[PDB]
């Protein structure tokens, strides 16, 4: 009775059942959750001025965009050799949080995370924030499992060290930051 052919309902139900066994990242009959393509589709502002590449997951940072800055600010062809070498141990806390948040998905984010970790800052896996002990503020409640006292947490949305006295699990707290010795890494080839 039904269309015994590929151009009927049976034809379609066959494609849907095929996605189960198809290991591809493209399923033409079912589509992709387009929100997950790393594009701010809700944004009231245009996407194109910050559109990185067709393969990138995050938009253009201001270090990425080039600007025709006043001639005078092009200081390197002049200070190059006398200019200090980059040493994250030399830099302060504010520059480290800048280096961390801005260089997301780069070795620099981990390099800043390492120097912060060397300064008693510990990253929370669950709450996605950096936390450190306040001056002499030892925890009121103290065990091997967790600690309850007053802690400075870095709120990036207001860009400042914030006092917040609440319970923190030692497990949900990130260990010493890793470094990937991944040769010729390209995030575009895996997408």
């Amino acid at each position: 009775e039904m269309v015994t052919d590929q151009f009927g309902m049976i034809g379609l139900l066959t494609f849907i059942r095929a996605a189960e066994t198809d290991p591809g990242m493209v399923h033409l009959a079912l589509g992709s959750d387009l929100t997950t393509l790393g594009l701010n589709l809700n944004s009231p502002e245009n996407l194109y001025p910050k559109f990185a590449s067709p393969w990138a997951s995050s938009p253009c940072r201001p270090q990425d965009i080039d600007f025709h800055v006043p001639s005078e600010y092009l200081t390197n062809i002049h200070i190059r050799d006398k200019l200090a070498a980059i040493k994250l141990g030399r830099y302060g806390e504010d520059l480290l949080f800048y280096l961390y948040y801005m260089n997301g998905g780069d070795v620099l984010q981990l390099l800043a995370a390492v120097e912060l970790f060397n300064r008693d800052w510990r990253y929370h896996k669950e709450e996605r924030v950096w936390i450190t002990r306040a001056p002499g503020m030892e925890p009121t409640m103290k065990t091997n499992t967790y600690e309850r006292g007053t802690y400075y947490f870095f709120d990036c949305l207001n860009w400042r060290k914030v006092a917040k006295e609440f319970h923190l699990e030692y497990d949900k707290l990130e260990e010493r930051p890793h470094l990937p010795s991944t040769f010729n890494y390209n995030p575009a080839q895996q997408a």
Partner: protein, 148 residues
């Protein structure tokens, strides 16, 4: 028979050249101005880490929230970018004035002891890009022919 043979030899050739091209895909750096100090170094970072920077961290207002050291870092190590223009912008707003000859930002510590139509001499705080730090200077002559 082999389904891929539905493609023409030209289409197979096309696919082959594309497959090859995939092994050496363009790197973000390829279509960008050389970054002498902070080149791109993509790496596998965990999902629980900040994959993307905070929203509206591209405004002169956000840049005003940063430390002077941060702004001085962006100015020297991120030359000729929107970030360098925004940092110099916030710096300028934060009452710092770039000396073109010395290639350093100066800020008045006191009121200048002398102000002429050509210069101003007083005690200023400046940023040493080699010693990487703030340094005070007494009896400094800021020639306006180097100011702007």
């Amino acid at each position: 028979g082999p389904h891929m043979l539905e493609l023409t030899k030209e289409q197979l050739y096309q696919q082959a050249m594309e497959e090859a091209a995939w092994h050496h895909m363009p790197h973000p750096s390829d279509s960008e101005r050389i970054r002498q100090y902070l080149p791109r170094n993509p790496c596998p970072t965990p999902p629980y880490h900040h994959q993307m920077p905070p929203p509206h961290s591209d405004t002169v207002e956000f840049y005003q929230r940063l430390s002077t050291e941060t702004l001085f870092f962006i100015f020297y190590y991120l030359e000729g970018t929107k970030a360098q223009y925004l940092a110099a912008k916030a710096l300028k707003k934060q009452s710092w004035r770039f000396h073109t000859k010395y290639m350093m930002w100066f800020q008045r510590h006191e009121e200048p002891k002398t102000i002429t139509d050509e210069f101003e001499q007083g005690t200023y705080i400046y940023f040493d890009y080699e010693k990487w730090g703030q340094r005070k200077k007494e009896g400094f002559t800021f020639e306006y022919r180097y100011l702007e």
